[PDB]
């Protein structure tokens, strides 16, 4: 099997200011290369805007819905309204080859057809109803425990975590 190895990235997560572990994510470059690359770069800080590296470092998980999903990646506004990509502005849904068939999957958040940006979510259960609407682009290969810790964080209105869920550090493995 001389197939190119998919990119592996990592998020070091902090809850209420306390470090709680590392999540390693495989980006399915061999299925959705454009979407995977956009994400990898926001993990490495390789994409710069006005000389400044931009990405997930220091961003948060602004919405946690136990038994459904955890969402973050809005390093623009930190509230779910932010949109940014290495392609400049929102980009098209590459394809819907992969499904939300299990917990631990990485999928692009959006606000309708072809509105992908920087925001993403991690599945906490199977999300059948989301197939074809959101582009699945990766999965947790290590640190499922961190995701469950994140999932259990207490939330308030609109399921906003009561304590800060921060990506203290990130990069590529």
């Amino acid at each position: 099997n001389s197939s190119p190895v998919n990119p592996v990235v990592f998020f070091d997560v902090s809850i209420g200011g306390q470090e709680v572990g590392r999540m390693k994510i495989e980006l399915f470059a061999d299925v959705v290369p454009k979407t995977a690359e956009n994400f990898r770069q926001f993990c490495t800080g390789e994409f710069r805007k006005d000389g400044v590296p931009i990405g997930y470092k220091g961003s948060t998980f602004h919405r946690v819905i136990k038994d459904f999903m955890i969402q973050g990646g809005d390093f623009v506004n930190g509230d779910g309204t932010g949109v940014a990509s290495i392609y400049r502005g929102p980009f098209a849904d590459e394809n819907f080859k992969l499904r939300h068939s299990a917990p631990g999957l990485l999928s692009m958040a959006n606000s309708g057809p072809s509105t992908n940006g920087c925001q993403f979510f991690i599945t906490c259960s199977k999300c059948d109803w989301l197939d074809g609407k959101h582009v699945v682009f990766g999965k947790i290969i290590d640190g499922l425990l961190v995701m469950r810790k994140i999932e259990n964080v207490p939330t308030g209105p609109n399921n906003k975590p009561k304590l800060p869920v921060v990506i203290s550090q990130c990069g590529e493995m």
Binding site: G45, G55, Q169, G171, E172, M173
Partner: protein, 31 residues
Amino acid sequence: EVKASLRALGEPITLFGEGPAERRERLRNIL
């Protein structure tokens, strides 16, 4: 090569916004 070495040591090959020199130094301190 720095990246392959860090990979061989199970260390991240790149931290957010890390440049070549910083990456080299990070590996240098581990060896």
